Ligand SMILES: O=C(O)[C@H](Cc1ccccc1)CC(O)(O)C[N+](=O)[O-]
């Protein structure tokens with residue numbers, strides 16, 4: 001595709017195609033989008049974040065990371081769609097235009113590029129990073145159990161060979177540390193959304209502890225409204241609540257870390273399909289999934305701009 | 308450097324320094340080395356191939372190209388080291404001497420001279436050529452996606468601005484066509500090796516198709532022996548296999564083209580570092596990388612001379 | 615015959631006559647038909663596929679293979695009639711024209727050329743390939759038990775001398791691997807039809823397992839519609855259903871592999887006669903069989919283009 005207008009949003013793409021997509025979008029919308037490299041993956045691949053801004057100096061921001069678990073293909077596909085949608089709706093949709101006129105959005109489409117490349121090359125269901133560390137045959141860490149929020153506690157595995165291995169220590173994975181450094185340096189993030197796939201859930205803070213967050217009432221209602229908005233499009237039903245009470249105890253998670261940094265609107269989305277196809281969600285559902293999910297994300301952004 | 312004996316092999320050099328190196332070597336070893344200009348780059352720079360021969364008439368040959376991707380500096384540096392090594396070992400090492408007594412070696416140290424100059428003056432990470440298309444303000448083509456082997460198929464970009472742009476048509480880039488005309492004219496090449504950088508892999512034919520080559524078993528055995536020889540020096544671990552099964556589908560590749568020309572021993576090396584430094588490999592690793600890679604290349608040459 | 619217009623479609627032909635037929639058709643309809651060589655048989659004979667296309671780039675396609683079992687002569691004869699039929703009906707029959715204006719059809723008339731030549735020269739009832747086994751005096755493999763779908767499981771024999779020998783490993787037979795690679799590389803096939811002879815059956819996915827396919831309801835109805843269309847011409851009755859529930863458990867089959875690749879409309883046809891003549895079907899039945907079978911095939915293609 002020589003234009004984001006010829007890019008096939010209804011099909012799954014490779015790392016190269018998505019990175020090329022990034023440059024096309026920036027070339028096509030230079031006053032709105034820019035490409036930032038926040039680090040290099042374990043295998044040296046550049047880690048890219050698309051910044052959507054209409055100006056200002058470090059305006060309140062919204063963080064959105066997708067594909068931290070490589071096999072969750074619907075997320076990277078949705079991230080690409082999100083990127084295009086932002087450029088299409090700014091100056092067209094009153095609400096989204098208002099958000100971007102006062103806030104910046106940072107979108108990381110492929111948070112785990114080495115694993116993504118691997119899902120295309122050797123194993124479609126690979127989910128961890130591709131780091132090799134100590135005296136262990138196995139490879140990779142579950143990057144979403146590597147964050148410094150209840151790191152190493154129940155809800156993660158200490159076995160390097162486990163699919164939910166948390167890594168040697170908090171932030172050991174460069175893919176995670178790169179985000180931590182960017183967000184802490186920025187210092188003005190108001191929302192932090194992590195997109196994952198399948199189970200159709202919208203969860204808020206703490207998977208590592210049963211302690212209720214100080215903002216439970218508000219985040220719970222924001223989640224309720226977001227799920228209803230998402231549902232209004234195709235009838236896709238999502239369940240919502242805190243991570244630990246909704247799915248299970250899970251430690252070292254991204255939104256527990258961001259919420260503890262003071263980023264109030266921290267939520268994690270588990271996208272489409274409740275198991276019919278699971279991680280192998282048909283390409284025919286990419287656009288519909290992205291469209292409905294957008295409604296839920298926009299709902300959250302709206303609460304962030306007015307609060 | 309006034310002599311190839313004073314040339315600093317442990318540091319990265321410029322195009323001028325490498326070209327001057329070629330003349331020093333030819334002047335020092337007239338009966339063994341000659342400099343051939345197989346064409347001119349897009350920007351008019353001469354394209355040089357060092358020919359190592361001990362006589363004969365169009366003897367079976369071995370082709371070795373390095374630096375087709377300009378930013379992969381470890382390859383041009385290794386290419387220079389190789390040239391020097393050939394002159395030191397011929398007549399001394401039993402095996403290499405036997406190889407050059409029945410075969411010629413054609414070494415192209417800087418296959419993409421325009422890109423190389425660009426990496427020194429404007430962008431250290433530039434990889435494509437410097438050709439200027441017509442309907443785009445972007446520059447260059449991925450020379451290793453421009454060959455007439457599955458040209459234009461999945462595994463390359465049709466967008467001129469892409470880092471993996473395949474170009475207008477097969478062999479559009481003069482840097483590629485120059486090699487194609489040279490090899491076709493010669494008509495007696497038995498080996499074709501393309502040297503690239505980082506990921507530590509030794510790959511054989513077909514990145515453009517899942518079809519296994521008719522000589523898969525043999526090339527796989529050769530690759531296995533070559534990686535073990537390379538590993539024997541410093542313990543550097545290389546993985547091997549076909550391009551598509553090891554990495555991913557990639558079209559317009561050089562060894563896919565050479566193999567389809569009837570050149571059985573077609574391999575591509577992806578040199579040192581698995582991502583720690585990536586393309587910015589420290590100069591302190593030049594000599595060790597060249598040394599170990601040499602063992603692997605020699606292994607391939609040996610299987611070519613006895614078969 | 616110097617023209618496909620004088621070609622005798624009511625008689626059985628040799629490999630050479632069919633191959634010459636292909637060239638005549640291509641010469642007469644260059645804008646619609648092209649001949650592709652997708653590989654070489656065990657004994658080195660070219661393996662040809664006729665591509666019918668009105669343009670486009672990698673358009674959704676329909677695959678049709680015939681003669682994988684050499685003695686099933688009615689299939690190759692039907693393949694020849696099919697090829698001619700497509701060139702006569704495009705631009706004449708609204709439905710077929712619509713199919714070709716949006717889709718490509720790939721037709722392999724003689725999937726097992728070595729065996730075909732053998733049925734003409736040595737054994738009219740030979741059905742396997744002609745590959746030579748290392749430690750065995752027996753020759754050939756049952757190409758339709760060599761596919762990577764339940765390969766080696768119940769429903770095939772591991773004995774080289776058996777008429778249903780599955781071979782050393784999945785895809786061991788180049789006649790099978792050639793199709794696999796082509797279809798995999800293409801990546802946009804929507805239907806995969808394999809044509810065999812006698813029993814008068816139309817079967818859908820899974821002969822190796824009793825597991826019901828996710829698309830059983832749709833394929834079953836499509837099958838019902840296809841058999842009704844086929845019967846409507848001469849009253850030929852066909853039975854339909856899954857391979858395992860209709861005939862018997864059979865592993866390594868073509869449509870089990872194609873369906874598992876994501877090609878929804880995968881069906882296998884067992885043509886005319888329920889046993890009176892068996893494999894030795896009279897030439898006088900070639901055209902009537904081809905005509906009625908076409909209606910069934912067209913029916914499937916129609917469902918493929920609208921879904
Ligand atoms: O617990 C996990 O690792 C996630 C679910 C999740 C998501 C966010 C916070 C805590 C848990 C599962 C998944 O989304 O990665 C899907 N999966 O690859 O099993």
Ligand SMILES: O=C(O)[C@H](Cc1ccccc1)CC(O)(O)C[N+](=O)[O-]
Nearest residue numbers: 376434503504514550557560575577
């Ligand atoms: O796919 C590529 O373009 C190469 C790897 C490669 C090398 C040979 C044949 C097929 C692929 C990557 C590289 O060696 O050029 C390093 N890079 O990404 O600049």
Ligand SMILES: O=C(O)[C@H](Cc1ccccc1)CC(O)(O)C[N+](=O)[O-]
Nearest residue numbers: 683741810811821857864867882884
């Ligand atoms: O099992 C076979 O070999 C086929 C029947 C068949 C056909 C398709 C998928 C599974 C089985 C019988 C035949 O069509 O090959 C006729 N024959 O016995 O040569």
Ligand SMILES: [Zn+2]
Nearest residue numbers: 069072196197
């Ligand atoms: Zn996940």
Ligand SMILES: [Zn+2]
Nearest residue numbers: 376379503504
């Ligand atoms: Zn390279």
Ligand SMILES: [Zn+2]
Nearest residue numbers: 683686810811
């Ligand atoms: Zn059959």
